[PDB]
Amino acid sequence: MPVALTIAGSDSGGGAGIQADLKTFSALGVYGMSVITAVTAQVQGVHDIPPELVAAQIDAVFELRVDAVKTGMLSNAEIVEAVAEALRRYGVRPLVVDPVMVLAPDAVEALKERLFPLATIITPNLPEAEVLLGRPIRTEEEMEEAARRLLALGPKAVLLKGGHEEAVDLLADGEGIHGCTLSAAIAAHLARGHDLPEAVREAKAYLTGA
């Protein structure tokens, strides 16, 4: 019954991609949908899909009613452009933007400018956030500041994922500051009508079982 769309790259050998997204969707009880922006070989080569087709792929997905959208690797600035308008063209939906760098600056400036305001939640991490802010994150106070300054870009929330001394994942929300395929799992709960904090908590708890 729940429907969720992933708009990302394709890695045939497992790992990040529509393949990894769609497995978590049906694993969490969500009817997964997919739109391919690029094709990857696990990295021997990368092939970008033309932006007009990337947009044309999305239109075909909405008749169906999508309950949540996941956004992985958008390799071109023009793909991000076409993606953004495509999501804007249709009705408001919980949108999860996973900013995957690997990184052309031409392209990243379109994530923040064209796509982050659309997001209901972005899930970056330590090195990836540094790309978005140009500043190195060396402290949790800096990590806390980065969650704030990121949230300022438009996303109703920000899950900053910190690997490292010891570090904790931080959820930047309006109420306050509280391998990863979490984005696919977070969007899955959102399709199920869960609110943002329980979607994040149930998603993280879902991964820790493995």
Ligand X SMILES: Cc1ncc(CO)c(N)n1
> Contact with ligand X (CB under 6 A): which of 3, 5, 16, 115?
16
State the minimum distance, in angstroms, from the CB of residue 49 to ligand X.
12
Asked whether position 81 contacts ligand X by CB under 6 A, the answer is: no
Residue whose structure tokens are 């769609």: 22
Q: How far is CA 188 from the centre of its chain?
A: 12
Q: Closest CB to ligand X among 27 and 152? A: 27
Write b or e for each residue in 175-207: b if 16 or more Cβ atoms lie within 10 A of its Cβ, otherwise e.
Answer: eeeeebbbbbbbbbbbbbebebeebbebbbebe
> Contact with ligand X (CB under 6 A): which of 6, 24, 34, 40?
40
Residue whose structure tokens are 């943002």: 196
User: Looking at residue 177, what DSSP letter applies?
Assistant: B
Q: Which does 72 bind (CB under 5 to 8 A by kind): a copy of itself, ligand X, none?
A: ligand X
Interface residues toward a copy of itself, by CB under 8 A: 10-14, 19, 22-23, 26, 32-36, 39, 41-42, 44-45, 47, 49-50, 52-53, 56-61, 63-64
